Design a protein around this ligand. Structure first.
Ligand SMILES: *[C@@H]1O[C@H](CO)[C@@H](O)[C@H](O)[C@H]1NC(C)=O
Ligand SMILES: *[C@@H]1O[C@H](CO)[C@@H](O)[C@H](O)[C@H]1NC(C)=O
Ligand SMILES: *[C@@H]1O[C@H](CO)[C@@H](O)[C@H](O)[C@H]1NC(C)=O
Ligand SMILES: *[C@@H]1O[C@H](CO)[C@@H](O)[C@H](O)[C@H]1NC(C)=O
Ligand SMILES: *[C@@H]1O[C@H](CO)[C@@H](O)[C@H](O)[C@H]1NC(C)=O
Ligand SMILES: *[C@@H]1O[C@H](CO)[C@@H](O)[C@H](O)[C@H]1NC(C)=O
Ligand SMILES: *[C@@H]1O[C@H](CO)[C@@H](O)[C@H](O)[C@H]1NC(C)=O
Ligand SMILES: *[C@@H]1O[C@H](CO)[C@@H](O)[C@H](O)[C@H]1NC(C)=O
Ligand SMILES: *[C@@H]1O[C@H](CO)[C@@H](O)[C@H](O)[C@H]1NC(C)=O
Ligand SMILES: *[C@@H]1O[C@H](CO)[C@@H](O)[C@H](O)[C@H]1NC(C)=O
Length: 340
């Protein structure tokens, strides 16, 4: 027997002590080695209540990633709280590794295995683990990259679909590659996506949200203003902060002649708004050479337009900005409990 509890977790990794890649360096001194022989214990005929939108593993991971980024990235200047802070800005090696989150003695992690679990409510196929699976801490908006996939149907996760200010996490069951390159203006870049695979998946997503919104017409529109970090698909590739225009991916016409390669325009930005919320940071100009990152789109973050309770349409725009939802999309099936 066990009871819902909140304890400070520890982390584990297969990080290499000789690497200079910042994720390895941070995990080498802040996490322990992953258990070589992990044991997973299935709990026969037991049912447990999960709630992904009220999970303290979320905020613990958020804390870890903030600390990771603050020890790893070296901006030449940070304008924070009215306070300029200058320091050397060497280029770094950057490629996220999976991090495992683990319970201390006297606690354990309950794992939801219901394939179609949406993130809240009862789960009937429950297991017990000491650590979660290896989660890559990918920092991005609009598109969730390099995560895990939904096992059966595409899942729609939200704390309250009725409230349109609550973000909608869409868990894909089929990854779609995004291939972003700054070839050898040095900040010019672009991302290539297979149109036929994206639009097929995009159309499957519309039918799933049709299921949740009373078979209403689902419409995609690009962000309605805001900072470039959420108006564009922002992510970090090999240390460089990429901003990509995704209006070509949320086009309701193709859900005809759009079957080849979609090419998103991208820019590498030196001056950015921190996702930690601490203000602005300036980095050095990009490195020479082919900057390339091939990633899997495994989810989409959407925010639905409000005020359409009188009309026949529901309109959605790529959302994000709160990185907790990024960690939320991977920690949704885990919950901490105390042994009794
Ligand atoms: C419960 O989940 C496990 C692991 O995901 C999988 O074998 C199957 O879906 C379920 N197994 C049983 C015995 O219910
Ligand atoms: C998730 O499932 C629960 C039932 O356990 C339900 O109350 C809730 O509305 C569902 N949420 C979504 C987004 O489907
Ligand atoms: C991309 O997705 C495929 C499965 O769809 C997976 O096998 C592959 O390892 C993924 N690549 C990365 C970098 O996660
Ligand atoms: C993904 O889920 C949709 C339903 O949401 C289903 O129609 C489709 O066949 C699934 N695709 C795969 C590859 O599982
Ligand atoms: C969901 O959101 C609607 C509209 O914002 C609100 O009326 C309702 O109280 C919310 N439901 C829950 C369970 O929070
Ligand atoms: C990614 O794009 C570059 C240039 O567009 C190309 O050279 C490379 O082969 C592509 N990689 C994949 C895996 O599609
Ligand atoms: C797009 O993916 C489809 C499979 O859905 C495949 O027929 C084709 O090879 C791909 N085309 C491009 C340009 O990537
Ligand atoms: C939503 O649409 C499908 C159309 O096939 C239907 O089966 C389902 O019952 C509909 N639900 C409502 C509430 O209209
Ligand atoms: C994205 O590109 C479209 C044209 O395809 C343009 O109208 C729009 O202004 C761009 N987005 C931003 C945030 O500049
Ligand atoms: C996703 O994983 C691939 C393979 O590990 C890596 O090359 C790529 O940089 C990753 N994408 C991001 C945004 O970290």
């Amino acid at each position: 027997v066990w009871k819902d509890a909140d304890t400070t977790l520890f982390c584990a990794s297969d990080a290499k002590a000789y690497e200079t890649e910042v994720h390895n360096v941070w995990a080498t001194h802040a996490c322990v080695p992953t258990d070589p022989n992990p044991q997973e214990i299935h709990l026969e005929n037991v049912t447990e209540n999960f709630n992904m939108w009220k999970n303290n593993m979320v905020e613990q991971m958020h804390e870890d990633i903030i600390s990771l980024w603050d020890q790893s990235l070296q901006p030449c200047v940070k304008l924070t709280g009215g306070s300029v802070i200058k320091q050397a800005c060497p280029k770094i090696s950057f490629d996220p590794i999976p991090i495992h989150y683990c319970t201390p003695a006297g606690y354990v992690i309950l794992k939801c295995n219901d394939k179609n679990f949406n993130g809240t409510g009862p789960c009937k196929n429950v297991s017990s683990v000491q650590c979660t699976h290896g989660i890559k801490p990918v920092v991005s908006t609009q598109l969730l990259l390099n995560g895990s996939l939904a096992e059966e149907e595409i899942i729609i996760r939200s704390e309250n679909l009725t409230n349109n200010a609550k973000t909608i996490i869409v868990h894909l069951n089929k990854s779609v590659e995004i291939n972003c390159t700054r070839p050898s203006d040095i900040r010019k870049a672009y991302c290539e996506i297979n149109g036929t695979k994206w639009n097929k998946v995009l159309k499957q997503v519309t039918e799933k949200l049709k299921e949740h919104f009373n078979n209403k017409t689902i419409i995609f529109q690009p962000p309605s203003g805001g900072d470039l970090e959420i108006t564009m698909h922002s992510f970090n590739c090999r240390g460089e902060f990429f901003y990509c225009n995704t209006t070509q991916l949320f086009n309701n016409t193709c859900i005809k002649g759009c079957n080849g390669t979609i090419t998103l325009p991208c820019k590498i930005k030196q001056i950015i708004n921190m996702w930690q919320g601490t203000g602005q940071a300036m980095y050095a100009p990009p490195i020479d050479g082919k900057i390339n990152c091939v990633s899997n789109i495994t989810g989409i973050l959407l925010t639905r337009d409000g005020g359409a309770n009188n009309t026949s349409n529901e309109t959605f725009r790529p959302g994000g900005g709160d990185m907790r939802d990024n960690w939320r999309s991977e920690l949704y099936k885990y919950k901490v409990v105390q042994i009794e």
